Amino acid sequence: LKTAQKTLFPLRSIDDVVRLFAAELGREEPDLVLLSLVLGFVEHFLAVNRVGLTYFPVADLSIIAALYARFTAQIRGAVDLSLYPREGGVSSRELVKKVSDVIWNSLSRSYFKDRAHIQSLFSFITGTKLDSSGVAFAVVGACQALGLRDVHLALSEDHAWVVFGPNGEQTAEVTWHGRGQTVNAGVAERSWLYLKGSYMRCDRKMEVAFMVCAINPSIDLHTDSLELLQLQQKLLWLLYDLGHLERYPMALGNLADLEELEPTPGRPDPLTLYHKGIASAKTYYRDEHIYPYMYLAGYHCRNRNVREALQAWADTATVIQDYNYCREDEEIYKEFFEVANDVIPNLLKEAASLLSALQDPECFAHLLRFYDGICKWEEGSPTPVLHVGWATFLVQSLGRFEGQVRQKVRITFQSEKMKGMKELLVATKINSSAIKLQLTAQ
Amino acid sequence: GLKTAQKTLFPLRSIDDVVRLFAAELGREEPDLVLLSLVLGFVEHFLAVNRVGGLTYFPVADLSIIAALYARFTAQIRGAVDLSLYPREGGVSSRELVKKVSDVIWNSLSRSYFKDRAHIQSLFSFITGTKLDSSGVAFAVVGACQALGLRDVHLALSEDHAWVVFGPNGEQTAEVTWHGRGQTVNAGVAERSWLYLKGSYMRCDRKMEVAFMVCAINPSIDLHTDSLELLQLQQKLLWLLYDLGHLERYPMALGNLADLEELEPTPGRPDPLTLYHKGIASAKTYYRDEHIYPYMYLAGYHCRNRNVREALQAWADTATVIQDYNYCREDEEIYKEFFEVANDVIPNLLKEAASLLEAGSALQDPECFAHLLRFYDGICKWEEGSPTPVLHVGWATFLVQSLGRFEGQVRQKVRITFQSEKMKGMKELLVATKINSSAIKLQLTAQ
Ligand SMILES: CCN(C(=O)c1cc(F)ccc1Oc1cncnc1N1CC2(CCN(C[C@H]3CC[C@H](NS(=O)(=O)CC)CC3)CC2)C1)C(C)C
Ligand SMILES: CCN(C(=O)c1cc(F)ccc1Oc1cncnc1N1CC2(CCN(C[C@H]3CC[C@H](NS(=O)(=O)CC)CC3)CC2)C1)C(C)C
Ligand SMILES: [Mg+2]
Ligand SMILES: [Mg+2]
Ligand SMILES: [Mg+2]
Ligand SMILES: [Mg+2]
């Protein structure tokens, strides 16, 4: 650590942490290892080993300098750079593989790899435990501590790896999902997990944004750390103000969800931030991201804006339609399954009871765009998506709209399945049996 | 269908009115299972499913609502099942007749729903929603059978499944619902899976069937909130059944009542520890000590009160029961309960204890170390002869971590009976002053 950094200690409050982040983000190379260990330390004494009162666990220089030394010396100890000629200020694959192996070999052979609060370098140093994405982050933190300035975090919506080399052009798998390979076959197979190449390639500032989104305020299934929520919210505003969330759609979604919980006066309202996330995905990631729409959909859902919610879910299906469903895409499958088979059916039932969205042919058209996207998603997929469970809720959901509301609705149907049954969907009588068979055809 | 006697207990305006109805029905040779299910169903629905500085409330059940629902259930069954086609010699039901009632219930359900959802356990949910969970179906078949006058059809339950017994002396069994047929449960008993308790399952009379529907009350509103009123209702109904002697052969019901007494103790009542012990005594006396949950119930209570010795003793008891079973695919519930104990609760309890020890005690007690070894030995013996492994490398790490919470001086002299070849195979390593982590790991995970 430099004298500059040392003077920001001890961290006695949330404002002290925000000052340390502000100071580090001002530099060309923010110290990822310092910042990770500090969030790790604060998360550990607020979520994992707690103590009414709200409190901040004071981070003395003595504790954080020790942890920093432990991480940096461990990496430097394990990697002899004089064996890796590093011509043109670019790292070789052999060097990135080696740092990957150093991180891998330092982990416990057996732990709950899915547990909360094993995301930070704190958990790696004090516990020898990292989650999936904790590993990729640790490889990048190690690379920075070795002075390898071209090694960066790549993320999809559910996986992480590294890019390196002349233009961030090279990719390497470093962690497990659900090594040393490129991600090219993932991009080529058009799975959601690799976003068809439209994944985030972070600079050091997005890597700080990632570790801030990684803060997990969960204490148990019933209780969040208020202090960790407050810390995340202030750190995300700092990154917002400095321009570092511009190319981070999920971070704007995260900050919007926090603003819905506890609005910051003078700040953009949640709807603005959800739209900025969607604008970010459209502008920088070829509109290939699902969560910015799912975020907006959740907010409208929670506020009982049924039209707006169904519109946002139809958008999510309009994105997913250009993918193939592959084995490792199960997170987004479950999110679509929850929307189709639980949230929409319940929202429509709420509406039917108050009766409205059910007299609005616009809401019916959103529902059809939703199912059409899902059917087009399934086309060309190496595994089916729609089984008989889906079919029931389709018919149930269609039937919440009277013949007069459904009759004139005309949308573009990308999918062969919805094309195949356009006459059944606008018919005065819903032929439930035929719709069911058509949807589950395979 | 309903008698003047029953009609005069209406409307139900309070929890006490519901207790009066149950009291009146339990006084009879044939308590009306369909009436009682519809009433709990109705009350659950307006307290947990469709709710209203705050209010607690009781949803008034008018005769008009309950008599309608009763008629709907009983007429629907009588409509579907023509008894004159099933000659019923000796006052005993045929398999074809039980299978038919099973098919009627199955055919009445929505073709797709979340069969795993809360609040789809009652005949209320079946009549108003055409939705039943697994055990809701078995109960519905028995309620249908009673409304058809089939006096020999009774609810059978294990700790995670339900079917029916019928015939001369409850001789016959039929699968009626899904887990996770018209076939017997004989192959389940023979495979020695926990799901069929090796034949030591509950064969309910009509009073235990009321107890089952009372245990079926689900007070959950969402993940974070219980209906106070439904907890209060369940507790008073369980006391009624207790006082009348109907919980004597229902170990999980005494566990349920004990959990409620810990939440809100009833003055003048036996304390929770008494009720958990009654549950265990019931399992030992009437079920060949083949039940796991009476011990798990006791273990949870000790755990929540930070009686570490007593908790580890109760968990070691649970492993002493399971050791005489084979782990089969559909026993996943109890697997997960053992996994949670071994790999989460015990490690965390021991870590708590280690911290209170460095600060200025179960960890200096060789009795607690012995309990831990009995636990692992039962689990290894459970695995022996199983068609599925139980122990993988995840288990091994927490064993070593948990052994290591006890110093060499505490572990050294402990000698327990080892049923499993696996624990016998490494008895010297467990009491050694140095824990050979690597060897212990391989021994427990091998095969
Ligand atoms: C959240 C933790 N996390 C990851 O999960 C992650 C790891 C990776 F390797 C790659 C991507 C990752 O995701 C994120 C990355 N950066 C920031 N945020 C990430 N998140 C937030 C995320 C998506 C959104 N969901 C919340 C939504 C889900 C859909 C929901 N809509 S709905 O209710 O209509 C659907 C039922 C609204 C809330 C939480 C998890 C994943 C990172 C930060 C370590
Ligand atoms: C919802 C309850 N229910 C069933 O789940 C059920 C269905 C069947 F087909 C067959 C048996 C069934 O179980 C019960 C039947 N009758 C009454 N109670 C039943 N219960 C209570 C039961 C077991 C105990 N658990 C709670 C315990 C679990 C162990 C725990 N101990 S621990 O914390 O030390 C273990 C980590 C204490 C709380 C709740 C569910 C299953 C019936 C009443 C419909
Ligand atoms: Mg994920
Ligand atoms: Mg697209
Ligand atoms: Mg169960
Ligand atoms: Mg035994």
Side-chain angles (χ1 to χ4, degrees), chain A residues 110 221-222 337 341 388-389 392, chain B residues 111-112 114 223-224 393-394 397:
Chain A
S110 221
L221 84 157
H222 297 128
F337 185 108
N341 295 322
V388 84
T392 315
Chain B
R111 171 54 163 73
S112 224
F114 293 136
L223 293 81
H224 313 139
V393 83
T397 303

Side-chain angles (χ1 to χ4, degrees), chain B residues 198 288-290 320-321 323-324:
Chain B
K198 281 176 310 189
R288 306 182 178 89
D289 203 8
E290 284 302 352
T320 303
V321 184
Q323 73 175 323
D324 297 320

Side-chain angles (χ1 to χ4, degrees), chain B residues 266-284:
Chain B
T266 314
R269 281 307 188 173
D271 55 39
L273 256 189
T274 309
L275 293 161
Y276 292 120
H277 280 296
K278 273 148 198 293
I280 291 157
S282 175
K284 278 169 180 322

Side-chain angles (χ1 to χ4, degrees), chain B residues 339-356:
Chain B
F339 185 107
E340 185 180 24
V341 166
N343 296 322
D344 170 17
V345 184
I346 283 167
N348 274 76
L349 215 54
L350 298 190
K351 176 131 152 26
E352 162 233 16
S355 283
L356 292 172

